């Protein structure tokens, strides 16, 4: 693929500051309004907007946003559920002292369902026109911890609750984050000396669910390594060190989004998220630690590489969580072979025909 073609697509993706600010004002207003009322309850007293920039993950739909609320939970003990390596139960260490979240305690185990119930409840109470904006709450999609709300029948904002743990990272993440040769073991060291988050998501057990398990979240680390991607510290700070990592990620994400949009009727792509793309991209970054391997004039090649790798995952049904190596994202239990074969077919067609889906 021509670097000028792909860079033409990326040039098109770049939107004006007005379209990204006009909405961000109202969204920021609603969020800042909710944050105040969240502190009225003793449970959500230690809550706070996790500084991620208050931006979205989509590229072109920018009408949607994504915010994440962190909540510090001191002295927590995780319990690995059914050896899923990624889902845990929350058991507080010392309970003779009064605990704010005791109302959600299902014994020794913290109930995620009641937590999200109270959270979504308070939010649903504040959404009853208290502001000057017209905001309505969307239905629960099922299993989804996010609480989406709609402003002016145009802007969608998903609110997610997290559990901040300043303790040491779980043992499942021991062999994770293989950035030693890429961003140095020093950066890995200092990064692993950061808190890890927890999101209320139930894992699959077959003909049922738990609704009381929590998944490991490392979105902040992803943002960090994303905004600081080069092996060189001055990467993308001068004309001689401009790379194309971010460009590749944007291209992959946009490809997946366009394919998911084109086949919205069918359900073959509904089990694929941009996170699989991001993960695959991180794996490629590990496989290509040198900035020279990411020259901006090689955008075509680099991108192709990513595509190839992604395809390989789909072809092998293997996509390890970048932080939890044993946790496979493309396992047969999660996503079926049919969907992955479909996506391989579509993507392969796109690559073989100069990506006509970009011009849609
Ligand atoms: N707005 C919003 N929606 C989410 C989020 N995480 C999941 N969802 C959606 O809620 C359902 C939960 O599905 P699973 O978590 O069990 O696995 C989902 C699902 O298989 C796919 C996401 O598909 P989506 O269309 O975006 O909808 C999901 C899904 O309907 O990737 C998985 N996934 C998404 N984010 C991650 C992630 N960060 N780590 C591991 N797996 C992830 C989220 O963080 N924000
Ligand atoms: Zn760079």
Author numbering: 160 to 219, 222 to 521
Describing publication, verbatim:
Cyclic GMP‐AMP synthase (cGAS)* is a sensor of cytosolic double‐stranded DNA (ds‐DNA). ds‐DNA in the cytosol may occur from infection or mitochondrial damage. cGAS is activated by ds‐DNA binding to catalyze the cyclization of ATP and GTP to form a cyclic dinucleotide with mixed 2′,5′‐ and 3′,5′‐phosphodiester linkage (2′,3′‐cGAMP), which in turn activates stimulator of type 1 interferon genes (STING). Activated STING causes the activation of TBK1, which phosphorylates IRF3 allowing it to translocate to the nucleus where it triggers interferon‐inducible gene activation and interferon production. We report here the structure of cGAS with dinucleotides and small molecule inhibitors, and kinetic studies of the cGAS mechanism.
To study the β‐pseudo‐active form we obtained structures of an N‐terminal truncation of cGAS starting at residue 161 (cGAS161)22 in complex with five cyclic dinucleotides (2′,2′‐cGAMP, 2′,3′‐cGAMP, 3′,3′‐cGAMP, 3′,3′‐cdIMP and 3′,3′‐cdUMP), and the linear 2′,5′‐GpAp dinucleotide. There is no interaction between Asp227 and 3′,3′‐cdUMP or 2′,2′‐cGAMP; in these structures cGAS retains an inactive pose. 2′,2′‐cGAMP contains an amino group on its guanine base; however, 2′,2′‐cGAMP is considerably displaced from the active site compared with 2′,3′‐cGAMP or 3′,3′‐cGAMP with its amino group interacting with Asp319 (2.9 Å) instead of Asp227. Each compound binds to the same site formed between the side chains of Tyr436 and Arg376. This site is occupied by the adenine base in structures of ATP, 2′,2′‐cGAMP, 2′,3′‐cGAMP, or 3′,3′‐cGAMP, and is composed primarily of London dispersion interactions between the ring system of these binders with the phenyl ring of Try436. Most of these dinucleotides have affinities weaker than 500 μM (the top concentration tested).
